[PDB]
Design a protein around this ligand. Sequence first.
Ligand SMILES: [Mg+2]
Ligand SMILES: [Mg+2]
Ligand SMILES: [Mg+2]
Ligand SMILES: [Mg+2]
Length: 1341
Amino acid sequence: KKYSIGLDIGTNSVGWAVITDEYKVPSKKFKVLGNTDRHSIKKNLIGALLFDSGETAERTRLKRTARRRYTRRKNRICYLQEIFSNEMAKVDDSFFHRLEESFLVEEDKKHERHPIFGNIVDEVAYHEKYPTIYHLRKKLVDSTDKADLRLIYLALAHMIKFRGHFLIEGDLNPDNSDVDKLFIQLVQTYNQLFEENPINASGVDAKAILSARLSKSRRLENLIAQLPGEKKNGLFGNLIALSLGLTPNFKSNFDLAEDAKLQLSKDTYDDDLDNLLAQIDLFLAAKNLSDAILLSDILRVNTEITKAPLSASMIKRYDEHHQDLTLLKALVRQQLPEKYKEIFFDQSKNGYAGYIDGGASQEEFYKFIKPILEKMDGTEELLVKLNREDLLRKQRTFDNGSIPHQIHLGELHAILRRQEDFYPFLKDNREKIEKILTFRIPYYVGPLARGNSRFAWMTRKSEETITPWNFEEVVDKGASAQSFIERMTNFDKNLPNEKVLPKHSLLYEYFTVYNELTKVKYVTEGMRKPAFLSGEQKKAIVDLLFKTNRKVTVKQLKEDYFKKIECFDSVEISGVEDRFNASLGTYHDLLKIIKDKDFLDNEENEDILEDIVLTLTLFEDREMIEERLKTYAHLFDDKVMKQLKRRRYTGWGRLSRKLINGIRDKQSGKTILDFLKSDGFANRNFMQLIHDDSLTFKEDIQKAQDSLHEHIANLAGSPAIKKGILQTVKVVDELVKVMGRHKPENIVIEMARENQTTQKGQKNSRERMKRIEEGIKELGSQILKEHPVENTQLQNEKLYLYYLQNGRDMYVDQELDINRLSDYDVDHIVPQSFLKDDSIDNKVLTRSDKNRGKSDNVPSEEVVKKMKNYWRQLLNAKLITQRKFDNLTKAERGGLSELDKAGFIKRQLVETRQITKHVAQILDSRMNTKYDENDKLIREVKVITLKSKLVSDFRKDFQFYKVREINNYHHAHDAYLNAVVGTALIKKYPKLESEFVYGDYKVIGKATAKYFFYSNIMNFFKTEITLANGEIRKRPLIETNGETGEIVWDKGRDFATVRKVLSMPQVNIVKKTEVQTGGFSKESIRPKRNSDKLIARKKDWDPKKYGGFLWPTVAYSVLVVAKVEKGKSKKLKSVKELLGITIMERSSFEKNPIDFLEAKGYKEVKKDLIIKLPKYSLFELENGRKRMLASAKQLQKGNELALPSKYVNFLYLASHYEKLKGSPEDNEQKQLFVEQHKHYLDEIIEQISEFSKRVILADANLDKVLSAYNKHRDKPIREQAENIIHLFTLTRLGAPRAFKYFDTTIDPKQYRSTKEVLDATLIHQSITGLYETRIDLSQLG
RNA sequence: GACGCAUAAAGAUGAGACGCGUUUUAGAGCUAGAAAUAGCAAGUUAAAAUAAGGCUAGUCCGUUAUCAACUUGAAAAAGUGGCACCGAGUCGGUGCUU
DNA sequence: TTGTACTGAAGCG
DNA sequence: CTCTCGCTTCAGTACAA
DNA sequence: TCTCATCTTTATGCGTCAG
Ligand SMILES: [Mg+2]
Ligand SMILES: [Mg+2]
Ligand SMILES: [Mg+2]
Ligand SMILES: [Mg+2]
């Protein structure tokens, strides 16, 4: 009658088991459909479902964003062509048509094969005159001669297409604020304002600073040594205040007009001219030098004065490359002529031919040429250029991502200012072209859709087409920026129909502090027992303490209030240790800004303050903050307004305004905050207030409050989890359906939840500030002295990593700066192409170019050699972990490899936690569907959440050991053990049922005590319990309920039953059959080949001319039974085989299958015998061999090896020989057990041999591994067991893979023939596999 | 087993952008050559595409979830499969039942 | 002319 | 006043019929 | 890889949800 269901939810697996009250698993004769002769099969109610992962959406977002960027770039080019078209019609009416036709072969081209001029001599004259586009760009900016309009369009289209980045927002005018000369007019301006007119000697310019690196410790000493120091922090010339601003907002030093805070001159300095701009020169010239140092950092030098330093530097690279190429060729032909063919012709050995024509990247070319370079003579300058990575450089390079768009804009403005006299239409629409280059869609606007995108939120004032010139007249920036946030912030969970408060909201802070405060309790010598703080006390301490310190300590709560006001000798307190968890931080911010305490303490003006804080949270864009805030300008002075608009906030609370201050109790009239301020002597907190039935909040919340697919579709987060949710809920539903719709007595879920010692918990959850502090004092730096910081800004990951690395890059020996992390790179050690891992152990803050060059690799052996000492210096200083040092040093151990792809990855754990939590909620909501007027829910089925630790301990303590490498049955056995342990546990201790059952509750560090209890609770299974003192204690071999005489656990029959179930051969393993989504092919384009297999990259682009893709992903296979017109003497041969349908043909095939099959050559197709076959389709063959359909032309291992449990226990015990960590008598017990049962190894090998001969058929691998075993038989038991544990890779279900046994590696046998399953028996397995439909394919055709 | 707060890890989801990479063409290769070729010279850049494409034609969308078989239903979605016992190499056997 | 067996390929910071 | 988490299919080239 | 915001699940400290 009664039955229980146990569940184990892995990220890729759902173990399931059904048990009775006797801990026995039922077995039933299930009906089997299909045309086969089998009508009934006996199966056991235990199994697991295996499925491929749920994939995250973010890759699809990346493709979406790349698609959008390409479309918008094409539209920019189209806009420029639309502007130039009418003038282009005058000189060459087919110019854009030849540019559009550049990709076609000359036979396909409608016009002449030369795109630019249409004739060969002018084209070769162009390339001789301008070797690169940069030469043409420089000629257009610098010269004044009327040039051809085609060249003008080519330069502007090149520079618009590759416009550089927008991470600089200012003007950065690369035309006067640029020449290193600027120091001279700076020192004159300094002599003109500073009336003493000091020394203006011919000292060396900022090139002296830039000779090594831009830093404090060298700039300051160089300028002070060059020109004698009259004022160290007030030199008023080329200061660090005028180069790289200070970390804090510290006041001006030796001020001229006023003492005002200082920062860097990017975007937070334009109001620190309040010394003069608020009271009405060197700051302007300073800005111009700051610009000069940025652009001389990002571009090297122009010796002759040009408006285009970029093009000049690129031509400098070209000329250097040409000279060094000529020198290299001459020296190579001189000293080693035999290498000349390899270096300069063979493009496959990473030579110069491989560096240009081949695929070798710049670092590979350098490391190839370097030994050849050093063995040669006269190569000192080539080698020092190689060491600077400045040898034979290209122009188009990964380094160019450093370049801000302002440089390209400056060049465009200069070119247009040159050529506007010769072409009036350039002067007519110069601003339109500048807008085409400069315009960027704001991130808060999103896509520019018209009601046809699920991703778009932008609203528009008019229906006109959006152009960069009319963007502000059409797009309603306001509502769109608000809709960027409000669509995305979650609703209040108690009031589902309105949004939560901002985190920094004053009302939210008030609620938070009064909620914490109202269950503070205090006691003192006159008391009988502790009291709560009355409302007047709570108000007085809020006024005198919280409003006067940004945080409060219980120590000052004593020594400030209780000693002075209502004086006590002592008071003892509970509800708080040390720091209060709440504070009025925003109140202190607003007090510091408005400087009106009475305004903030005023009651009637709270709503406008909440409107302000809401505004300052929602909006980032300064003009939008201004516009929204402007309404309140008749209470605030313009100064304090222009200040307050800086005070950005972010993040959101959990509650609506109406919950905490909107709803009122009908009889009291008080809000929740009103009760928290004063509730007499009850002082009820929030939870009490929403669950006390006396107040009228409870039924108001109740009044504030179907398909399964809707129930999973509404909830947010990763789409990945929804797969798992649907799978296991469908499993549970079909298990209920199998046994005649009878509901379980309970469902047991293995939650991935734990408990641990309080000390360990706090030791983990420490503030990262303490970590930074103790590491930096351990390594003895002074970074905190010069750069001070507290915890909350380390929540930013770049600044955290900057303090983690002690202000210095560990790839390159240079100091880092704190103000310029914008262009600095976060870097993952392991490539994101290889393995998703976003732990701090895998993250680097490094200079951009170094990470860019570290494409697809761990840091290479050379940077390891350069930096391993500093890496060790940070390792022993507790700033990086051993995993971080091992990852950093990974190149010395061979770099990444297949065995580095092993070990379970962090995300799987978070996924299983999320998945199981949701599963538990949906199963409780679905199963308990009935309720009464007095009973709010009827516990028809108790969902019981076991912690993993309990079942894992039960496994070890009774030697039901588990390993994974042998078979997938471990999932099913874990589910069965969860069912057993949970059912026995709740049977033994009914008074603990309210702990484990979902939705129920009962009412030295607390976690410590709970963990110790969570150990002791399991003891009732044991026969003998060893206490902490080392003395044994007995326990009856029959267990009873205690309050009842009902037996709960017999240490006889029940252990035998468990061992019998664990040793059962028949376990249901079902791989979910899935039809493939995702990308059409592998993404790489492949060269022109006469091969038919090349997928056409475009409709007209025949890939036999143009190249194409390869490896088209098969969406699914289809069985076809038809005639294929075979032979020279043509005749119709009837034949049956699988066709693969690729994703590209999925929609075309499903539109009309018969016509698509006739397009493939099949005729007389039997339409009704077309079978849809997903991946992993299951086929049953002779002798009991099972083959899994991996693809239209590949099979997979479909059987599973049911090894006896004694061998599994012996294998687990033989490995991990000295790492059990129990007690010594136990380890020696297992040592004589494994020594006396050594022959089990041979028995296991015999089993593996039979099973391999039965279903694997890889006989060549079989005899190879048998010879390897017979060679290595005399090795110690440890390595033999370990390598045999590897050996089971031969026999697992699914994909063949390589494995190695001791010294020797075995390659997989590949089942590359799907002909042989065409006469097998196809199996349609249900979600559990208990329901089957076996079809015989030999009877078809 | 839930909720608010602080302190933690480890992860998600959407938008705006940058630089590379690859492909085809353009950038006249020269000499000795019956030549299969051999010697020499040169190589740095540009145009275009970047899931085929789709229609509501937007400077939008097209790689994330949804998926055993059969019977209904456009689809959504609904429905379809006896029990007890003795045993165990991927499940077998025995006995009642319509 | 068609199956095998073996080695190699794969968009990224 | 209630407790005792997982791992590949296709592209090529070279031989057996 | 850069810039923007938004969540989610587990760990520990505080408080609380019932009869
Ligand atoms: Mg588990
Ligand atoms: Mg998927
Ligand atoms: Mg990296
Ligand atoms: Mg499992």
